[PDB]
Design a protein around this ligand. Structure first.
Ligand SMILES: C[S@+](CC[C@H](N)C(=O)[O-])C[C@H]1O[C@@H](n2cnc3c(N)ncnc32)[C@H](O)[C@@H]1O
Ligand SMILES: C[S@@+](CC[C@H](N)C(=O)[O-])C[C@H]1O[C@@H](n2cnc3c(N)ncnc32)[C@H](O)[C@@H]1O
Ligand SMILES: C[S@@+](CC[C@H](N)C(=O)[O-])C[C@H]1O[C@@H](n2cnc3c(N)ncnc32)[C@H](O)[C@@H]1O
Ligand SMILES: C[S@@+](CC[C@H](N)C(=O)[O-])C[C@H]1O[C@@H](n2cnc3c(N)ncnc32)[C@H](O)[C@@H]1O
Ligand SMILES: Nc1ncnc2c1ncn2[C@@H]1O[C@H](CO)[C@@H](O)[C@H]1O
Ligand SMILES: Nc1ncnc2c1ncn2[C@@H]1O[C@H](CO)[C@@H](O)[C@H]1O
Ligand SMILES: Nc1ncnc2c1ncn2[C@@H]1O[C@H](CO)[C@@H](O)[C@H]1O
Ligand SMILES: Nc1ncnc2c1ncn2[C@@H]1O[C@H](CO)[C@@H](O)[C@H]1O
Ligand SMILES: [K+]
Ligand SMILES: [K+]
Ligand SMILES: [K+]
Ligand SMILES: [K+]
Ligand SMILES: [Mg+2]
Ligand SMILES: [Mg+2]
Ligand SMILES: [Mg+2]
Ligand SMILES: [Mg+2]
Ligand SMILES: [Mg+2]
Ligand SMILES: [Mg+2]
Ligand SMILES: [Mg+2]
Ligand SMILES: [Mg+2]
Lengths: 385, 390, 386, 387
């Protein structure tokens, strides 16, 4: 048949005040506090948030002592949960702790599992446009509250971005922007719309440099359903590792299923994901392709990956195959868990910054896995100039 | 110039894995509530750690269910019936923090708005009878057989917690070509010699699945088999290993072969777009491959809170489109044929029934053991019709 | 010859805002709410409060459903904990619930072993010791003053204490010291409170009590004598059901069995026997058979018949009656089998939330069945008295 | 000539396995573990125990770190909760922790709180304890001895003992009337088997050990597991908290109580330190020939190191024509009841508390407790001009 429809692709983000991101953030704050004092701290800490209470749960091996309830109440306060009026208060909320405890170049993976990494040309950050934009809107929505550019806002928020795509699977036009924010009851829906349209949407669209993808009719949906007066843990339970697609590539890329936050870099779910980001970004910035995705997988006890899979979605260049690039990857990168930590210098308190507004393509941060410092070595292995 | 073999991996876990225990407890509560009150609103999270199950979230129902009894019964059925195994359902702790009894159905009205924003992906492939990718299909079969040989006593001394992993060598046109690596880690009784377990699992679990799945054609020659490749697995489940609902969404879907919107399925009633739309996309994709419009299809959908019609939809067929149709043409057919408003999905697929507990382990998709409404090939004729075909 | 030291006896009370009473009140709100819907409900509900969280634990058999989290949040709003400013808000607090256990009629045995004590004294019209009676009146008044606006800037958590000088006959003589620590808004000074509480709490209560003939001379008054009482309730201060048994009973003037009252349905002999034994003691003192009377009863699990009973009048017996003699009189007038006690006092009704602060006994402001002076005739008669 | 009835007075105790004494014991294991490393540790810890879970709660200020979960699981195993079989297992139960609050000197050490506390002593026994609570503690202690030493098999840790005594008209113990014991057991035995094993190896062994054969003549009504099957115990279906056994911890109802718990409180809490002191005061009043039975009440205001209350009562057992007021005068001169002085007088900054968490805090001949030393007799008499 002749009817065609336009393909729209969507990615979402959430603020630090979303109860899932609260948990990812408390988990990574506890990890950081421990690495500050004992860099070799073994840490797998789940946070759960429900009305009035934060549960801290999981396994720690450490020489340090850290005041977990103070870490929790303080992080809740930076986030902005500082009264019962806004629905949660760091100073007066519950904290419950249930923690217990159950290197070598060739020391094996602590678990089996699969981990994916992705990079693309479409943005300077090497990040797909939909999630990059969704993240920018969620960062900005927190910023205009914290710097007091828009008054009456509260920490809980979600953003969503839908883009029109050409037949070649390339971004073409910004179609639909959704922003839902928590706020005071003294503020309505019309006032919020002009505030966020001005100070968040129009602002990010300029700062991202995409004003040529945002001409004509754009559907803008601001708080399109219900009064977002209360939020965070009040009414809506949060857990660590329930925002893994927000954490990554916003659905543009595949995922091995493992969460990041609350895990020290010994956990291949976290460090191998970061490694695959590193490998992928270096594949693309070395001009071996426009888009690259790399899976790795491990067996518990074994140190050499049990698997590695390169895909460039027909963006391959210099008449190279994915099997050829992958050979180069094996030649350039060392993917034993203990080597990745050495290579990316991961034994440091840098994780709390990654718990909200993405672990990848972070221009506001300085992440070891975002370094494009293996491009030359890749080009050499493929006999390129 | 030199070349590497591309190797793809997917994993599964048994119902005894602490994350799957949470998913199963969450979907046992959902089922129990839908049996008494099909319009129940349920967003129920389970946490497990040493000695204790926490039940947490939002519930709006006219029914009463004994959560602690359901929790203990599920654990005893899973196999956690003793402190010797590391967790006993009869003696475990159960804490319940649930509210939202109205104090703070549109799912029936088809013009009713999504309950939240979000993205959802569905996928299908003619690689298997169940329209599923081989890696996850094999991993799920291995995890199901691991639990099966224990509950039926085909292999003695086994315990509930376990993990399975499958790696396949892939050709240059992204097709599976050979089984390369199989991993099976299982909780077990202390009096077991690895060699006896290695031989038992090789014969009763791996070899059995390779025949049941009909892939001996892909399992010739040298296959790497790792069984309990690390340490001793005597304690398992929540003992020294925290579990949470929604921490196995890739195992619950396509094993990394397809994309994902990030939402969990267990603990959520069909009014949750995160689950209903993902089941819908599985339906749309399976009906696109069953109608021979492609060999593989991936469909994404997205919604805005308070809005019935999706904000977006994305059909990919990975250059496998047939009948010389583009992906923009198959999508035109999809919109003509499928009602993707949430309320319409719930009705199209008759979702207000207690059928969710069985999905909480071994996958939501390609379940020939079950009869799930989103696995039905019942929209093929309508799709081919709107594509001026038959 | 050898010098004498005036004997000084103390009793203490607490507001509904004290974290331990928060727990007793919640436990008894859940009990009342189950009996409102089902009078045969079996209830053994413990409450724990700590920073931000109420835990409800224990065992129930009921045919009814009760919204525990709402009863809890509501009962914190009434107590006055309705903001993070005060250190606890019922609307945003945590609630976690771990409850389980999904002549035969009077030959029904008692659910447990145990000892329970009952006391009466003619010192007061409510037949309560002077010190715990005054104590209760002080903490009741401290709450009333905040909830009616008589004193502003007050917060719910508070403790009152009362020490009395006594004669050589174990009889009260004078009020030596009243102490009153209260929570308050940080916009207030101890000096302002000292005068406001002395006026509107201590002086009002000394009058309302009819105790001004014991009020003369120098009274030592300690008002917020330490630190600043700005936060209270569960903030920085763990609370548990069954942690205020002496405050709930006779303030140490009488003996105690050990059993908590709150969170227990009347089949729990810990409660129903102590209620019975208040009733007997009160009827002994109102019968003119002694000025002070204390009775101990003990049960064995499974046996309806008490295994022990022990009347004591501290040598204040009247009409030449021995304790043994009064004790045989009690057995004749009083069915002290669990099931009888329930029938006698009509306990299967929602009347316990009220008992959870300010005392279980001598409650003039209530209508408690165990406070009924209605076996006076049958006690006299059985003793050949007019 | 109206009819008489004999007066019957009762006391109870519970084993270390009773869910409430679990909490007290765990709370005092934490206190000890902290005093062991920091003697100035400020500890206000509550334990809660329900099916499968121990909640540890309250306030602590210490320079030390202790592995609370390790302390909990081990205490539960020592008690004998070491299996899902017996209804709770130390090795696999939950542990959740919710703690926080990281001119004369002894005059500025004012009381932590307001509160009344009570002390008691009596001639009736070698350990200066009333007869009922003394017998109940020995029965409950015996009831765990025979399990731990394999003297009576098929026993589990949960356990309750009650003791009723006939009283003569002068409020004095005449006859051992009724003994209750309810013990947790394996299914491999029944009420009848226990009936005879507990009689021979617990009850009869204790009557001889306590030397009350002359109270033990005639017809003793002995009720043993009188009701239900006691197969599962501890927290399995029965919530325990710290501070819900304060009368078993004291004198079994014979004496009065101020209503403060002991367990999980450091000696800076007067609820604990004053009560211990008051036992010490009363046990010296009685051993100094000054009386047969002595009860003393002390009371504090928060901020004030000087008691706001003192009350000596000897129940007309006072000797040498001395009034209660005169005995009180000497008590004041010989005893410093300021909180800091009590801690120093009895050396309370030591890990000695887990042993008081069961079987009584007073009259404890199996232990060596500061507040049990009769070492103020000579001084008290001197104050009354005696020899
Ligand atoms: C803090 S201690 C190390 C202190 C040092 N060994 C000492 O004696 O003071 C380490 C272990 O205690 C447990 N733990 C519990 N709460 C902790 C906390 N707040 N910080 C660190 N470790 C904690 C973890 O299992 C961890 O391995
Ligand atoms: C028990 S249900 C319906 C009760 C019914 N309206 C009645 O007659 O009592 C009411 C609410 O209780 C809450 N709830 C708490 N525990 C529950 C449980 N075990 N089963 C069902 N609802 C429960 C949910 O918020 C639910 O919407
Ligand atoms: C809810 S009651 C009666 C249920 C009612 N017959 C029904 O099925 O619709 C059943 C049991 O639930 C337990 N329970 C748990 N939470 C409860 C609550 N909030 N109110 C009442 N019972 C509750 C009690 O142990 C009680 O025996
Ligand atoms: C861990 S202690 C002393 C630690 C020492 N100052 C350091 O930096 O390593 C500090 C506070 O931690 C809290 N705490 C929480 N859990 C504790 C535990 N298991 N042992 C000791 N203190 C604990 C108490 O409030 C205590 O005063
Ligand atoms: N009224 C609302 N409008 C839009 N999003 C909301 C609203 N209330 C809550 N949310 C967000 O969506 C999630 C699910 O309700 C919440 O955790 C919060 O982040
Ligand atoms: N010794 C072990 N070998 C392999 N897998 C294990 C072992 N112990 C636990 N596991 C599994 O891996 C997860 C993380 O260690 C556990 O939840 C469990 O499923
Ligand atoms: N600053 C204070 N002064 C006196 N009593 C207080 C103070 N703060 C709390 N309290 C009371 O005493 C207990 C704390 O020791 C609390 O339960 C509370 O009721
Ligand atoms: N079957 C029983 N017989 C007697 N006492 C029991 C029995 N089961 C439990 N107990 C004790 O009585 C308490 C409450 O019933 C429990 O905490 C336990 O110590
Ligand atoms: K939720
Ligand atoms: K874990
Ligand atoms: K306290
Ligand atoms: K109980
Ligand atoms: Mg979530
Ligand atoms: Mg993982
Ligand atoms: Mg997990
Ligand atoms: Mg969602
Ligand atoms: Mg208290
Ligand atoms: Mg009791
Ligand atoms: Mg108890
Ligand atoms: Mg106290």
């Amino acid at each position: 048949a002749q009817p065609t429809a336009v393909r729209l692709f969507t990615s979402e983000s959430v603020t630090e005040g979303h109860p899932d991101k609260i948990c990812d953030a408390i988990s990574d704050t506890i990890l950081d506090a421990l690495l500050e004092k004992d860099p070799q701290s073994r840490v797998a800490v789940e946070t759960v948030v429900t009305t009035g209470i934060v549960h801290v749960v999981g396994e720690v091996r450490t020489s340090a002592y850290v005041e977990i309830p103070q870490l929790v109440r303080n992080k809740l306060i930076e986030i902005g949960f500082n009264s019962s009026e806004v629905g949660f208060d760091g100073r007066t909320c519950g904290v419950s702790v249930s923690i217990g405890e159950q290197e070598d170049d060739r020391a094996g993976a602590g678990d089996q599992g699969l981990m994916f990494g992705y990079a693309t040309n479409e943005t300077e950050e090497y990040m797909p446009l939909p999630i990059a934009l969704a993240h920018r809107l969620s960062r900005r929505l927190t910023q205009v509250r914290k710097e007091g550019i828009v008054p009456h806002l509260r920490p809980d928020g979600k953003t969503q971005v839908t883009f029109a795509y050409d037949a070649q699977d390339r971004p073409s036009h910004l179609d639909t922007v959704v922003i839902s924010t928590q706020h005071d009851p003294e503020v309505d829906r019309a006032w919020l719309e002009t505030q966020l349209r001005e100070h968040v949407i129009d602002w990010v669209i300029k700062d991202a440099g995409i004003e040529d993808l945002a001409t004509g009719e754009i559907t803008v949906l601001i708080n399109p359903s219900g009064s977002f007066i209360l939020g965070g843990p009040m009414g809506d339970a949060g857990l660590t590792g329930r925002k893994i697609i927000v954490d990554t590539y916003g659905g543009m890329a595949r995922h091995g299923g493992g969460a990041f936050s609350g895990k020290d870099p010994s956990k291949v779910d976290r460090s191998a994901a970061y490694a695959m980001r590193w490998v992928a970004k270096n594949i693309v910035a070395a001009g071996l392709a426009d888009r690259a995705e790399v899976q790795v997988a491990y067996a518990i006890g074994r140190a050499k990956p049990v698997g590695l899979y390169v895909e460039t979605f027909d963006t391959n260049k210099e008449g190279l195959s994915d099997e050829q690039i992958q050979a180069a990857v094996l030649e350039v990168f060392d993917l034993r868990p203990a080597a990745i930590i050495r290579e990316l210098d991961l034994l440091r308190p840098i994780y709390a910054d990654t718990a909200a507004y993405g672990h990848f393509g972070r221009t506001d941060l300085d992440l070891p896995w975002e370094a494009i410092d293996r491009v030359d070595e890749l080009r050499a292995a493929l006999k390129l100039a």
